[PDB]
Amino acid sequence: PTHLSVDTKFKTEGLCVDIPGIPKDMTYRRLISMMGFKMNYQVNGYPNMFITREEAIRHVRAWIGFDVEGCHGTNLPLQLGFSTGVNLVAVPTPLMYKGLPWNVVRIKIVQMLSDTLKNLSDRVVFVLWAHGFELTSMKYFVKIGPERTCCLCDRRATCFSTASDTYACWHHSIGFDYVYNPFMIDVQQWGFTGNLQSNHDLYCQVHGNAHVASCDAIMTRCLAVHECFVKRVDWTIEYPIIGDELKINAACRKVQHMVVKAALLADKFPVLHDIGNPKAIKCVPQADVEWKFYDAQPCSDKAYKIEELFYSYHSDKFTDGVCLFWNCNVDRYPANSIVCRFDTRVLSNLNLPGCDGGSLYVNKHAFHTPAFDKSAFVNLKQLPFFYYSDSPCESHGIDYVPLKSATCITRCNLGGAVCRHHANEYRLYLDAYNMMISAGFSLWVYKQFDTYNLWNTFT
Numbered sequence: 001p002t003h004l005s006v007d008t009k010f011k012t013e014g015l016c017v018d019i020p021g022i023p024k025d026m027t028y029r030r031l032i033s034m035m036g037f038k039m040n041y042q043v044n045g046y047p048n049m050f051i052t053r054e055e056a057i058r059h060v061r062a063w064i065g066f067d068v069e070g071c072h073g074t075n076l077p078l079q080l081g082f083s084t085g086v087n088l089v090a091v092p093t094p095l096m097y098k099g100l101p102w103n104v105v106r107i108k109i110v111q112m113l114s115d116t117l118k119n120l121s122d123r124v125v126f127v128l129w130a131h132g133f134e135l136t137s138m139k140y141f142v143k144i145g146p147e148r149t150c151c152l153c154d155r156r157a158t159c160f161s162t163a164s165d166t167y168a169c170w171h172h173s174i175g176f177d178y179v180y181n182p183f184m185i186d187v188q189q190w191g192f193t194g195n196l197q198s199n200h201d202l203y204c205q206v207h208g209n210a211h212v213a214s215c216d217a218i219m220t221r222c223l224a225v226h227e228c229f230v231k232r233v234d235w236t237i238e239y240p241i242i243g244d245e246l247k248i249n250a251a252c253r254k255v256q257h258m259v260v261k262a263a264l265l266a267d268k269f270p271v272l273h274d275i276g277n278p279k280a281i282k283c284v285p286q287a288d289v290e291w292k293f294y295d296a297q298p299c300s301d302k303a304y305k306i307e308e309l310f311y312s313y314h315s316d317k318f319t320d321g322v323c324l325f326w327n328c329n330v331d332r333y334p335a336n337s338i339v340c341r342f343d344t345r346v347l348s349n350l351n352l353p354g355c356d357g358g359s360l361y362v363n364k365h366a367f368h369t370p371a372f373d374k375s376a377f378v379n380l381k382q383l384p385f386f387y388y389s390d391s392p393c394e395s396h397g398i399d400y401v402p403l404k405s406a407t408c409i410t411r412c413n414l415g416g417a418v419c420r421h422h423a424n425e426y427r428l429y430l431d432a433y434n435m436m437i438s439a440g441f442s443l444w445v446y447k448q449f450d451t452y453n454l455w456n457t458f459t
């Protein structure tokens, strides 16, 4: 049981309005055949156009919600809608494009999918809420066959060109006209009572139905993400490295050590309440403080209520000392906190649009994150950049341009001149910091946090 068998049944009920008289008994094998695709018994890595829910989750980065609306059936024009917000009108002679033939529409489809997916995935997964027209229209922009490699590289083939008779991946597909060997999943096959809007609206207020095909494409992919990442959570599924994942994670660990170490020196809190990851370790192992840990998994639905995390009877006194919420998303942070909160609005290859304003952050693992809300941080202030060091000024072992900064909290800068070692360390840390900030993480601290209190820690 690795792939979805072509002899598995397909419920055709949601298909009988666009396709009246459709057989109740239907398989993937009969469906694909009906759609105009000859599989020809092929053992070349393409067993089925349709995929399992587990395979769809593994290839979430590849998801594109797709919906076709019968605008007026080879006699009438079709409105193609994609979760990218695009709307194409195809004729058989929220970006709403006018009526054009299939030969020109298919070119735009390859451009759009290639530009959206090149940095994200090795494939496309057409996420559907199948009513009939989306499956009839696939023969006009899709070609299938044995699994292939790009004509210009070693990545797997995702497009095809009828002009040059060649294949290409998402990167080298300029001028290509066919979507080669795509994947798809029908969300209606998962046992839903009622239509798309009714089921989507149960979990999301952010996507509205303007009645265009792209709105349904967005609601479909949203509902698919809710089902697989919000209500169901699988943190065992690993995901490929497609960006700055290792530098972002390394930066995160450096920023946390720094920020937490400095707060303990500036305000000498006797106790630290570490609320978050049940698999966490002391980020400042040599600190004087009393480290008390409290397990809390990453919330994927709605941000935790601070009342339910702390109260109902542990130190019990969370007001004693400082609270460290490192990626533990709560509705309103106490005033004595140090917080790292991922901003779901950040635009990146790691961040995918989520459910109810939240986002799917995929970095080694998929984490659906609740919508960033600026009000969560009313009793806190933004933590400013600073680099603190108590290490000796010793170069050991790159070139040098004198460093001048007010945010380099070191003994050398106290003395009047920053040494080469602390200048390399400051610049390296500022890069890790800028990396982590740009990757969408925001840092917040208690209002009394003053870096002026760190200069006295060398006496």
Ligand SMILES: O=C(COC(F)F)N1C[C@H]2CCC[C@H]2C1
Pocket (backbone or CB within 6 Å): 019, 034, 035, 036, 132, 135, 136, 137
């Ligand atoms: O092949 C077609 C369109 O008709 C043909 F004559 F062009 N289709 C695609 C399949 C979708 C399920 C029912 C099938 C109808």
Ligand SMILES: [Zn+2]
Pocket (backbone or CB within 6 Å): 150, 151, 152, 153, 154, 155, 168, 169, 170, 171, 172
């Ligand atoms: Zn290529």
Ligand SMILES: [Zn+2]
Pocket (backbone or CB within 6 Å): 200, 203, 204, 205, 206, 207, 218, 219, 222, 223, 354, 355, 356
């Ligand atoms: Zn939604």
Ligand SMILES: [Zn+2]
Pocket (backbone or CB within 6 Å): 392, 393, 394, 410, 411, 412, 413, 418, 419, 420, 421, 422
């Ligand atoms: Zn120094």
